[PDB]
A and B are shown apart, each in its own frame.
Chain A
Amino acid sequence: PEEVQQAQTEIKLFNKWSFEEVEVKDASLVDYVQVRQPIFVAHTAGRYANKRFRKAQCPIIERLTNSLMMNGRNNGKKLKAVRIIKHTLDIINVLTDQNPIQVVVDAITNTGPREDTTRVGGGGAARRQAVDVSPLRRVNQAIALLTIGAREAAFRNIKTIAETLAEELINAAKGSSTSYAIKKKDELERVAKSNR
């Protein structure tokens, strides 16, 4: 068909958003976020969970696609997550028509809590010790916080999951702390610097 000829030259993301010209804003995420893979759909179910750093081999978009089916009511549903991801990407490209990939990457870069904190047992005296956060660890924490805020949005609201996800992604791209993930990153930095 016509879109078959269109995608025959440029392998866009589902032939609706270009899978090129994606940029990572924040530093310390190069080789921690997979954005160099030209693919068609985020369901490449090859064996990547076996190793530690092979989890960075899957795309962060495919990581969020796995994060959609993270609930008792939906653990193991694939095409529901894929269609919801396509709807959320269309909602992002409607709210911000630059690129769903670029806007999502900007939100991921702006939703990162740069510091961490640990509770040390101390032999019976727990204390708050500020510690660093690893690159893939920070990326996974941001993705998890975003998916959790999106899931917590659709508790008493007729809004679609794609709609709440796009609203949280817009709040994270703005960094306005109007989403749970951005509020969580701000509170995490505040707590880490509270006991630095």
Chain B
Amino acid sequence: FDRTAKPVPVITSEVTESLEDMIRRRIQDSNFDDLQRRTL
């Protein structure tokens, strides 16, 4: 039969590992997102 929406996506060691290495980069090159402080 068919499906109507996409519910809860199961995570595993591999999905967590993929996001793990990408954030290992994304602080290894120290790029970083923030609120910026307006003067005056």
Consider the complex of A and B and state whether they touch directly, i.e. have CB atoms less than 8 Å apart: no
